[PDB]
Amino acid sequence: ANLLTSLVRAHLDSGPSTAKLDYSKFQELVLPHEDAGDVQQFYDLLSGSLEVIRKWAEKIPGFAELSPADQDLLLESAFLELFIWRLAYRSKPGEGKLIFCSGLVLHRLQCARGFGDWIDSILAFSRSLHSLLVDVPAFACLSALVLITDRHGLQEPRRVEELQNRIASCLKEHVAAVAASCLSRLLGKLPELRTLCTQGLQRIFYLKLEDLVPPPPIIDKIFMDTLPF
């Protein structure tokens, strides 16, 4: 309620207004054509979301009351998932149109070489998300539940589960206020998201192998820290 408002407000301040959208690099028709620039663009797009998602997380009531080590672990473990979740909701998959948190708009083919096949998987997940017609308050709860979740190595796992439970209840109550089957279809997108993001890890592995350009240190640390072997 006040929780709901704070979550909505955190979501809306974490991304571009309709009027801040930048179409100046956008190409409707992409010409017949990975090189270093594609790989650089991929890392730049990921990296443009680090600070934004950290600041968003800091506005979730209770998140700053988790241990700093648990805060960092949750952000790192959820970063790719959150990047994709927010991108999927923001983008317009019926146009092949990717909308990043800076407002930058790009057509599928302008990214695809950096992203690899993963971009198609992301657009498929975005089309599925869009069909659900998730309203902003439900999305703002769900994003929080992507982040505030069990992860191996947490210092205070019960406190994480308690804040999770608060956000879950807030969502449940909101979905009842608007209208269990709707709830479960919303929650079901979280595992699909995780699985989707395995392909993200696979893509980074591939790019680190190829090594046309190395990942930036912060992305590299996320990648390394989230490999459970």
From Swiss-Prot:
Region entry AF-2, spans: 215-226
Chain positions covered by the region annotation Binds lipopolysaccharide: 157-179
UniProt effect for mutating residue 226 to E: Strongly weakens interaction with STK11
Induction: Induced by cytosporone B (Csn-B); directly stimulates its own expression. Induced by corticotropin-releasing hormone (CRH). Induced by growth-stimulating agents.
Compartments where located: Nucleus; Cytoplasm, Cytosol; Mitochondrion
Expression sites by tissue: Fetal muscle and adult liver, brain and thyroid.
Protein modification: Acetylated by p300/CBP, acetylation increases stability. Deacetylated by HDAC1.
The NR LBD domain, residue ranges: 1-226
Family in the record: Belongs to the nuclear hormone receptor family. NR4 subfamily.
Assembly description: Binds the NGFI-B response element (NBRE) as a monomer. Binds the Nur response element (NurRE), consisting of two inverse NBRE-related octanucleotide repeats separated by 6 base-pairs, as a dimer. Interacts (via N-terminus) with NLRP3 (via LRR repeat domain); the interaction is direct, requires binding of NR4A1/Nur77 to NBRE-containing dsDNA and lipopolysaccharide, and leads to non-canonical NLRP3 inflammasome activation. Interacts with GADD45GIP1. Interacts with STK11. Interacts with IFI27.
Domain comment, as recorded: The NR LBD domain binds the lipid A moiety of lipopolysaccharide (LPS) in the cytosol.
Job of this protein: Orphan nuclear receptor. Binds the NGFI-B response element (NBRE) 5'-AAAGGTCA-3'. Binds 9-cis-retinoic acid outside of its ligand-binding (NR LBD) domain. Participates in energy homeostasis by sequestrating the kinase STK11 in the nucleus, thereby attenuating cytoplasmic AMPK activation. Regulates the inflammatory response in macrophages by regulating metabolic adaptations during inflammation, including repressing the transcription of genes involved in the citric acid cycle (TCA). Inhibits NF-kappa-B signaling by binding to low-affinity NF-kappa-B binding sites, such as at the IL2 promoter.
The protein, known as: Nuclear receptor subfamily 4immunitygroup A member 1
Species of the source: Homo sapiens (Human)
